[PDB]
Design a protein. Structure first.
Ligand SMILES: CC(C)(COP(=O)(O)OP(=O)(O)OC[C@H]1O[C@@H](n2cnc3c(N)ncnc32)[C@H](O)[C@@H]1OP(=O)(O)O)[C@@H](O)C(=O)NCCC(=O)NCCSC(=O)c1ccccc1
Ligand SMILES: CC(C)(COP(=O)(O)OP(=O)(O)OC[C@H]1O[C@@H](n2cnc3c(N)ncnc32)[C@H](O)[C@@H]1OP(=O)(O)O)[C@@H](O)C(=O)NCCC(=O)NCCSC(=O)c1ccccc1
Lengths: 248, 304, 248, 304
C-alpha cells in the first residue's frame, strides 16, 4: 500500500505541477481561443491531480489532496522534471505539452486495465481528457512546425530544449516494477514504443527533426528536482503556509 | 418629421418586437449597440487578469479549480459577445485594437488589484453580483442577439457567483485572520462594485437615447439601488460591514439609503488613471504583440 | 513613537524590496563588472533595511528585522511602489535605480540632520552608499541614452514605463508632516526641487526626454500595492513561513 | 637533448624562482597555465548561479547579506583570475566564448542544484572547504601571477567558509527539521565535493607535466585525503554523518580511509551531462546574448 501510494502520488504530482504552469498562461495567450483551451487543459489536469492525490491520502490513512499539495516540500514532491519546466514561449509550452499528452495517452490507455479498481476509474476519466489534450498539442505542433519560417525554428529549439528530460518518461524503479508484476502499474519502459511511434510521427508530420542527443535527465520521481520546482512551490503554498490547518 | 424608416423602427421598439441582424436600424443605434456590447465583451477579457493573478496561489485545490472554471467561462462569454457585436457589421479584431489603444473602454472594476485571496471571493460574490443585476436587466434589451447572449450568460454565471459567495462564507466562518481578510476585500471592492452600474441619471450622456430606444431598460441609479437592496442582507449573512457611514435603511421608501459615490475617482478610472489600468493594457498589449508570430504561423498553415 | 515607527519602516521597506529585486540580477548581467556592481548595491541597500527595521522593532518594543521582513503580509508592507516594479531589461533596472538613488540622495542628505539620533546615524551611513549608487545609475543612464540608437529608445520607454510611480516620491501624509513639524522626518514634497533638478539634468545629459504625462500612482506607503508585491513576498518569506520562530 | 632555453627553464623551476609574465616559457606550459587558470576563473563565475538561486529566499536578513557578500567576492575572484590569465597572452573575451561553447570547462561542483537553504550552507562550508585546500596548495605554484592571486584570494575566502560553517552549525543546533535539512545537503554534496580535486593519480593526463613543472604541488589524491582528514572532524562537530559506508579511520597510516568515488558520474559531468550543466550554460548564454545591446551602447559612449 506504501508502494502504491508513491506511484499514485507521482501521477498526481505530474498533473499538479503542470496544471500550475498552465495557470501562468491565463490571459496571456495569442488568442482568446488559446486562453480558453489552456485554461481548459489546466482544469482537466487539476481534476486528475485531486483524483490521484485524494486516493493517495486515503491509501496513507491520513491527510487529503490539500495536505499533500500544500505541506510537502520540493524534496518530497515526485513529479516528472518535464512538467516543472518553465512556460517559455508558446512553442515551449506546446512542446512540453505534446510530450506529456502523448505519454498520458500511452499510460492511461493502459493504466485503465489496472487490477486496482480506483486506478482504473481515475484512468477511465483521464484518458477521455488526455485525448483532447493531445489533439490540441499535436495540432499546434503541426501549425507551428509547418507554419512560418520563424515558428518552425522556434518549434525545433523548443523540442531541442526539452528533449533531455524525456528520458524520465521511461525510467523504471522498484515501485513501478513491483506494482507492474502485481499487474497494477504500467512499467514506463514499455511505454517507449507508443510514445516514440506517436511523437516521432507527430514530429514528422509537422516537418521537424528528432534530436540525436540521447536524453539523460531523471530524478523528479526520487525528489531530485531542477532549481525550477522550489520557486513554483513557494508561490503555490504561500497562503497555506501562512495560515495552516484552515478551511477555504 | 421623422422619415418612414424612422417611424416603423420606433413602432417596432415600442411593441417589443426583437431587432434582428437583417432589420434596418439607425446608424447611431447600430453604433451605440456596437459601443456597448463591444465594451461588454472587453470587460470579460480584462477581467481574466485580476482573477487569473490568484490561480497559482489559490489556497485549496477545490477553490483553485472553481477559479479556473470561472476564468474559463469569462473567455467563453467574451466569445458570445464578440459574435453578437459582429452581427452589427463590426470586426472583432478592429474593436480589440481600439480597446488596446484605449479608444474603447472596459469595466472600471478590472483596474483594481487583487491583493488577497479574499479579493477573489469578493469579486465572485460582489462584482459578479453587480454584473448579474445589470445583465439580467438586459435579458429584455431591444436588440435580439444581445438579449439572447444575456439569457445564455446569466444561466451559467449565477452558479459561479454562488460559489464565489461560498468561498466568502468560509472566510466568514473561519479564523479571525480569515475574517479580517474578507472585510478588507469588501472595504476595497464595495464602492468600485457600485460604480459598475455607471454614472448618475443626470450625468449619463448615452442614457437619453438608450432608454428611449429600450436598450437600457432600467436607469443606472435604478440598477444600483436594486443591487444594494439585494446585497446588504448578503453582507449581513457574512457578519461583515459595508464601508459606508451613510448607509441606513429608509422604511418610508422600503429601500436602503447610501452615501455619495466618489465620482472624481470614477472619472480618473475611465480615462486610464486608476490603479491597474496601465498594467492591464500592457499585459494585453504584450499578449497580442508577443503572440503575433503564433497567429502568422497559424494563418500560413491554414492556407496550406 | 508609533508614528516614527511607521516612517522608519517605510524607509526600510523601500530598501528591502529593492534589494530583493537586485538579487534576481545575480549572475545574469551583461558583464561581471555589472553583476559585481548590482550585488554591491543590493548588499548596501539590505544593510540599510536591517538598520531601519532593527530600529523600528526597538521602537515597537518587540520583534526584530526578521519578524518584520518575514511575518508581515503585503497589506502591512510600506515600500514605495517604485522599488517593487519588475527588473525588466537592464534599462528598466537602471531607470528604477536612478530615480531611487536620486531620491535617496535628496532624502538622506537632509535626513542626516534629524533631531532623532538613530535616524541621523542610519542616514550618515546610507548617504555615503547612495552617492555610489547614483554615480553608477546616472552613469549607466548616460551610457544607454547616449549610446546606440537601440539603447536610447529602450532607455526612453523604461523611463516612460516607470514615470507614473514617481508621484509617490513626493506624496506627504500626516506621519511625514507631524514628524516633519517635530523636526524629525523630511516632508517628501520638499524633496521635489532637488530630485527634479538632478533627474531632469540627468535625463538631459543622457539626451533623453522627460515624460509630459503627469505621474499619478501612489499607495505603497498605505499598504496599497501593485499585483507585483504579493509574489515577491511569497518567495521571500517561504522558508520562514514553513519553519517559523527558528534561528538560522 | 633539451635546448638551452629548455634547460634554463628547468633550472628556474627547480630553484623555485617565480615565473613572471616576461620570462620565456614552453608553449605547452603557457597553454596549460592558460588552460588551468582560465577554468579556475570560469568556476568563480558559474558558481554564482547556484549560490545566487537562494538570495531571494534566504531565511534571515543576516544570512542573506552574507550570501550576497559571498556572491560578490566570487565575481571579484573571477576578475583576478582573468587578469592573471591575460598575462599569458590570452584574451578574457575569447576564453569566455570557449566556456560558453563548452570548449572550456568549469568546476564540476556547480552542475549540482541548490534544493534547500542547507545547500547554501553546505557549499559555503564543504565546497569552499575543498577550494581552500586546493588553492592554499597553489600559493606555491610555479607561475608567479597565479601564486599571487591564490594568496590574495585565500585570505578573504577562509572568512566566508567560516561563516558558511556557522550557518551549518545553526541548523545542527536547530530544530529537528533543520537538522534533517542539513544532513540531506551533506548527503547530496559530499561526493561532488570530493570530485572537485580531480581524477585519480593514474587517470590524470595533465598531472605528469604539471608536477614536473611544479604547477601542481600536490597530487589530486593527496589533496583529497587532506581535505577528508580535515573535514570529517567538522562533520562530527555538527553531529552529522558522511554518506560513505566505507569511511573508517586507519591508525596505521594516521589517515581516514574512504570509499571509491563514482568516476562514471564524474565523466558524465565533465562532458556536459550532469544535473544542471545545460541550465548553467543556458543562463550564461542568455546573459551574454541578451546583454549584447548593453555592451554595444557602452562601447559607443566610450568612443564619444
Ligand atoms: C450601463 C453600462 C455599464 C454603461 O452605461 P452607458 O449608458 O452605455 O454609458 P453611460 O451614459 O452610463 O456613461 C458614459 C460613459 O462611461 C461609460 N461607463 C459607464 N459606466 C462604466 C463603467 N462601470 N466602466 C467603464 N465605463 C463606464 C460608458 O461606457 C460611456 O462610455 P462611452 O461613451 O462608450 O465612451 C452599459 O454599457 C452596460 O450595461 N454594459 C455591459 C455591462 C458592463 O460592460 S462586466 C461583465
Ligand atoms: C586540480 C585541478 C582542479 C584540475 O587538475 P588538472 O591536472 O589540471 O586536470 P586533470 O589531469 O586532473 O584532469 C583531466 C581533465 O578533467 C579536468 N578536471 C579535473 N578535475 C575537474 C573538476 N573537479 N571539474 C571539472 N574538470 C575537472 C581537468 O581540467 C582536465 O580538463 P582539461 O584537460 O583542461 O579539458 C586544477 O585545474 C586546479 O587546481 N584548478 C583550479 C581549481 C578548480 O578549478 S572552484 C574554486
Amino acid at each position: 500500500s506504501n508502494q502504491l501510494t508513491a506511484y499514485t502520488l507521482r501521477l498526481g504530482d505530474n498533473c499538479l505541477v503542470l496544471s500550475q504552469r498552465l495557470g501562468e498562461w491565463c490571459g496571456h495567450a495569442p488568442e482568446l481561443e488559446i486562453d480558453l483551451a489552456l485554461a481548459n487543459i489546466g482544469l482537466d489536469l487539476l481534476g486528475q491531480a485531486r483524483n490521484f492525490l485524494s486516493y493517495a491520502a486515503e491509501l496513507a490513512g491520513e491527510g487529503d489532496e490539500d495536505t499533500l499539495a500544500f505541506t510537502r516540500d520540493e524534496r518530497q514532491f515526485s513529479n516528472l522534471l518535464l512538467v516543472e519546466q518553465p512556460n517559455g514561449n508558446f512553442a515551449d509550452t506546446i512542446a512540453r505539452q505534446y510530450f506529456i499528452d502523448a505519454w498520458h495517452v500511452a499510460l492511461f490507455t493502459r493504466l485503465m486495465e489496472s487490477r486496482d479498481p480506483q486506478l482504473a476509474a481515475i484512468s477511465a476519466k483521464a484518458i477521455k481528457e488526455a485525448r483532447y489534450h493531445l489533439r490540441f498539442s499535436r495540432g499546434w505542433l503541426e501549425r507551428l512546425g509547418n507554419g512560418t519560417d520563424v515558428s518552425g525554428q522556434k518549434m525545433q529549439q523548443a523540442i531541442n530544449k526539452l528533449w533531455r528530460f524525456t528520458a524520465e518518461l521511461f525510467d523504471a524503479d522498484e515501485i513501478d516494477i513491483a506494482l507492474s508484476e502485481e499487474g497494477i502499474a504500467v512499467d514506463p519502459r514499455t511505454l517507449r514504443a507508443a510514445w516514440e511511434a506517436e511523437v516521432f510521427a507527430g514530429i514528422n508530420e509537422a516537418t521537424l527533426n528528432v534530436p540525436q542527443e540521447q536524453a539523460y535527465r531523471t530524478g523528479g520521481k526520487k525528489g531530485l528536482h531542477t532549481e525550477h520546482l522550489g520557486p513554483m512551490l513557494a508561490e503555490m503554498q504561500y497562503l497555506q503556509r501562512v495560515l495552516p490547518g484552515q478551511q477555504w | 418629421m421623422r422619415s418612414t424608416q424612422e417611424e416603423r423602427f420606433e413602432q417596432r421598439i415600442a411593441q417589443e418586437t426583437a431587432i434582428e441582424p437583417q432589420d434596418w436600424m439607425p446608424d447611431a443605434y447600430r453604433k451605440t449597440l456596437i459601443r456597448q456590447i463591444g465594451q461588454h465583451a472587453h470587460s470579460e477579457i480584462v477581467g481574466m487578469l485580476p482573477q487569473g493573478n490568484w490561480i497559482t496561489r489559490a489556497p485549496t485545490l477545490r477553490r483553485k479549480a472553481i477559479l479556473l472554471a470561472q476564468v474559463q467561462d469569462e473567455a467563453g462569454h467574451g466569445l458570445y459577445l464578440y459574435s453578437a457585436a459582429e452581427t452589427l457589421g463590426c470586426a472583432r479584431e478592429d474593436i480589440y485594437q481600439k480597446m488596446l489603444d484605449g479608444r474603447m473602454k472596459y469595466s472600471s472594476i478590472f483596474n483594481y488589484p487583487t491583493l488577497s485571496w479574499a479579493d477573489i471571493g469578493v469579486i465572485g460574490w460582489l462584482v459578479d453580483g453587480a454584473a448579474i443585476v445589470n445583465q439580467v436587466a438586459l435579458c429584455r434589451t431591444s436588440y435580439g442577439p444581445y438579449a439572447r447572449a444575456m439569457v445564455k450568460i446569466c444561466k451559467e454565471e449565477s452558479f459561479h457567483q454562488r460559489q464565489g459567495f461560498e468561498a466568502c462564507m468560509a472566510l466568514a466562518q473561519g479564523s479571525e485572520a480569515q475574517k479580517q481578510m474578507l472585510q478588507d476585500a469588501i472595504n476595497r471592492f464595495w464602492w468600485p462594485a457600485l460604480m459598475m452600474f455607471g454614472p448618475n441619471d443626470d450625468n449619463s450622456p448615452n442614457s437619453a437615447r438608450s432608454l428611449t430606444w429600450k436598450i437600457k431598460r432600467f436607469t443606472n441609479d435604478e440598477l444600483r439601488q436594486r443591487f444594494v437592496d439585494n446585497t446588504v442582507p448578503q453582507v449581513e449573512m457574512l457578519g461583515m460591514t459595508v464601508p459606508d457611514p451613510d448607509l441606513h435603511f429608509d422604511t418610508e421608501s422600503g429601500h436602503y439609503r447610501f452615501g455619495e459615490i466618489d465620482w472624481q475617482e470614477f472619472n480618473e478610472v475611465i480615462n486610464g488613471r486608476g490603479i491597474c489600468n496601465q498594467e492591464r493594457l500592457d499585459a494585453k498589449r504584450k499578449a497580442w504583440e508577443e503572440g503575433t508570430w503564433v497567429r502568422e504561423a497559424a494563418l500560413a498553415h491554414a492556407q496550406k
